[PDB]
Amino acid sequence: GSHSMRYFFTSVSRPGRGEPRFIAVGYVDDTQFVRFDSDAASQRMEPRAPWIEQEGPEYWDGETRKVKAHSQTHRVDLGTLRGYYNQSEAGSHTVQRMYGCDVGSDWRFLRGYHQYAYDGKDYIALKEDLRSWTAADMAAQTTKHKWEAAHVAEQLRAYLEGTCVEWLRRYLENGKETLQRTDAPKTHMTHHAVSDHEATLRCWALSFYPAEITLTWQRDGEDQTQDTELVETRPAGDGTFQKWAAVVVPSGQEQRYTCHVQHEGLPKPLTLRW
Amino acid sequence: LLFGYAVYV
């Protein structure tokens, strides 16, 4: 019964086109609840789940304040980084930040994290101990020293270990019906003939939540991850996820192949035969 | 609830 709250922040420079784009999305497990989009009109933090709308103006006022703060820092970061790497003003660049906290079945703090990436790859990240930084390069080292002097970690550790978990539980409870839910997959199989000497078996997992799932193809023991095709667990659009896996099986042995579905909404891992 | 002490890089 583990859980987690995570925030993702995207910053994209718009060379010759004004202020950068800023997008902030908040999640609790695989369910999003808040968001901030510089392109949007409210120009404030907005709810994206029913259970968060019940919060007071105090909540949204301070959530919008803090999110704008993030924006300001990312707006300045884009320039700073462009400098460190002495890049041109001709190209677009991306900054991404991600912090959150994991709790166990008892909801007690488990892990904390705060990553920072630039142009698609790590730049700096807080270490598991929440006391030290990991610089990805010589430039990142400058941020590291800068941050050690500013006692930034000390602040994130306080947040990640307390406030973060404190509010995660608040959400987990307020959204009891929604978040503490655990929908089971509606599995099945489909046969597809492409040739006279072959066929395609597709194991399907649908309407399941959380997205955490593992589908496996097996020859009554034999692993077959070599000829299997798994598509990224995709969202359905109603809060549930989908996913499937297939293998090219020569006509005949197909009756010996069995699929394995592992999800926390299932007592015992399913095994589907054909 | 958002973190409250983001600092420049």
Partner: T-cell receptor
Framework: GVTQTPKFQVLKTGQSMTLQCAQD?????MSWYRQDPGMGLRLIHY???????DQGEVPNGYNVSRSTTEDFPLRLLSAAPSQTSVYFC??????????????FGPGTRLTVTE | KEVEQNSGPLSVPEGAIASLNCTYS??????FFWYRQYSGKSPELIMS????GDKEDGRFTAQLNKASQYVSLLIRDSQPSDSATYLC???????????FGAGTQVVVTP
């Protein structure tokens, strides 16, 4: 830390006074407060960074600017007997530092007569 | 206001314990401070607490209960020099406004 001058000041209803405030901690968040026996501390004006200024709880009668990040001069164009009190200056790191503590200045005591 | 403190002089004898309470309303508060202000001087920061629990430093002990949105300050082995009025301050973020209490005046008799 936070330095501010003058320490004491006498003014006649109508004089122009400018309370000087400076900080050397590379802070981006400075604030001005006035303390009175019946209300305690009350924000007048504050600035989260250079060029950015916003009114507080009792901004009336007071002017403020922030061309640089080191200073944050509080101005009174036409002194009023009501503006008699103790003015404390203050600063916070803002987005420049993780230490959330706000620091006060030594304070200036001002009195306005008719 | 948004932060409430013990309204009135808390007279304590030399060597005794002075206990200070504080209560805030914004559940989003993340930073909590304790300020000491001697008559005629400026507010001096003496305690900061960022996570709920106990923080001890010298004869000062600060507690934090976010669940009950409560903050305290325990001054051990009181000295007449501790005679001052103590301000409770709390905030939400680096851009949030600092919210102070009326301040509880503490008199340490000799």
């Amino acid at each position: 830390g936070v330095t501010q001058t003058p320490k004491f000041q006498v003014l006649k209803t109508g004089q122009s006074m400018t309370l000087q405030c400076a900080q050397d901690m590379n802070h981006e968040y400075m604030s001005w407060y006035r303390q009175d026996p019946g209300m305690g501390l009350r924000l007048i004006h504050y600035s989260v960074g250079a060029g950015i200024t916003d009114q507080g709880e009792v901004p009336n009668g007071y002017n403020v600017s922030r061309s640089t990040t080191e200073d944050f001069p509080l101005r009174l164009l036409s002194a009023a007997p009501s503006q008699t009190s103790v003015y404390f200056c203050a600063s916070r790191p803002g987005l420049a530092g993780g230490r959330p503590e706000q620091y006060f200045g030594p304070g200036t005591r001002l009195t306005v007569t008719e | 206001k948004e932060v409430e403190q013990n309204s009135g002089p808390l007279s304590v004898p030399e060597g005794a314990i002075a206990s200070l309470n504080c209560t805030y309303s914004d559940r989003g508060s993340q930073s909590f401070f304790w300020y000491r202000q001697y008559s005629g001087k400026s507010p001096e920061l003496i305690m900061s607490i960022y996570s709920n629990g106990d923080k001890e430093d010298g004869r000062f002990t600060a507690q934090l209960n976010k669940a009950s949105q409560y903050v305290s300050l325990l001054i051990r082995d009181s000295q007449p020099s501790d005679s001052a009025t103590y301000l409770c301050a709390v905030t939400t973020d680096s851009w949030g406004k600092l919210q102070f209490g009326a301040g509880t005046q503490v008199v340490v008799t000799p």
